[PDB]
Symmetry: C3
Subunit: 115 residues, 3 copies
Amino acid sequence: QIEDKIEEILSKIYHIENEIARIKKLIGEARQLLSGIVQQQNNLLRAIEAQQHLLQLTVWGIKQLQARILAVERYLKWMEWDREINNYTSLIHSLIEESQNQQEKNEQELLELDK
Amino acid sequence: QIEDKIEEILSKIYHIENEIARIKKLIGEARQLLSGIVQQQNNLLRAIEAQQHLLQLTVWGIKQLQARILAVERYLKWMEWDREINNYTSLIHSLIEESQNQQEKNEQELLELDK
Amino acid sequence: QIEDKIEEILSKIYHIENEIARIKKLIGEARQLLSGIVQQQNNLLRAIEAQQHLLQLTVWGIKQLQARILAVERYLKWMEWDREINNYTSLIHSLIEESQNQQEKNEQELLELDK
């Protein structure tokens, strides 16, 4: 049986030795999908940034039309909105700053992973 | 050779025993980058929410200017846009509700993972 | 000691054989959270798309009010903004096109992973 036991041991070591190579292959794949998720987020953030510039342009557009229509009505003859707009504008800038930080870390850690 | 075989077996078991510790280290790292990706998404969603409040504020701003300019033109003397705006507004609210749900699950599952 | 060594070898092979099953369980879990992160991103992108249609609707709304107020002022009696709006609009369309591509790959790779 010492004889037989070495046969068994060797068989188990081989089949499990297989498991490891399996696991390392899958782990290889998952590294790719992970970088894809990280890049996707940098993209999603840049769109969000750009959309904010767009939103700032339209608020300015609206403010100008307020002036022009106000004057026209005088020739012929609001503050809450300004607050809520200022507040939400502040928030979106925080969330963007934080999202920029979070994006640098995630990219750094993903870079560290390639060792 | 029984002697020699036990030498080989022991050598393989050691080198593969190494593989496992390697794999567990990398798996440790990847847990971090994964929480970073999940947090990043909560951030990206909150920005998107805020931007929607901002967009709602500007649509209201625009509607008011429509009233004021309409009146001024009467003193002196559209519906599709309202539809498309109502529709897209409905959609963004769904996508946000779903994104809020998806964010709770992902955070729960990520929490379950620390066992 | 040949006797004893086979006892040790068998003990190590069992405890490490455990490690593998452990690792495969955790790997099972992490596959779920990964699909959840990928779906979440498809959602975040669709919201961003919709918000862009919304932004396009409001820029058009603003342009119309510019015409109506311009005419009213003539009866009675800008180009940079148009540029910046056109530019940022172009960018957001690129970032969205790229984000759509990135989303297909990530979904494909995640699909490949289930072998």
